[PDB]
């Protein structure tokens, strides 16, 4: 079999990493 959705899963991973970095930035701004 050759199911191929890994590029959608990669883009989802990248967007969740972008969100993680933005949440770190929001917490830094709050703490200061």
């Amino acid at each position: 079999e050759r199911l191929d959705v890994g590029e959608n899963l990669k883009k989802a991973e990248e967007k969740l990493k972008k969100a993680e970095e933005l949440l770190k930035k929001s917490e830094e701004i709050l703490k200061k």
Binding site: A12, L16, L30
Partner: protein, 42 residues
């Protein structure tokens, strides 16, 4: 409290950006699961 209010605004703007990224991740996850179903059926 002008500086505190500016920090809250900047924090919330950044938080909203984070949520939009998670929303966009969710859209890609729907495309992926649709793709699994289309592979299985087609």
């Amino acid at each position: 409290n002008s500086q505190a209010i500016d920090n809250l605004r900047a924090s919330l703007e950044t938080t909203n950006q984070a949520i939009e990224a998670i929303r966009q991740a969710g859209q890609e996850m729907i495309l992926a699961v649709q793709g699994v179903q289309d592979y299985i059926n087609n």
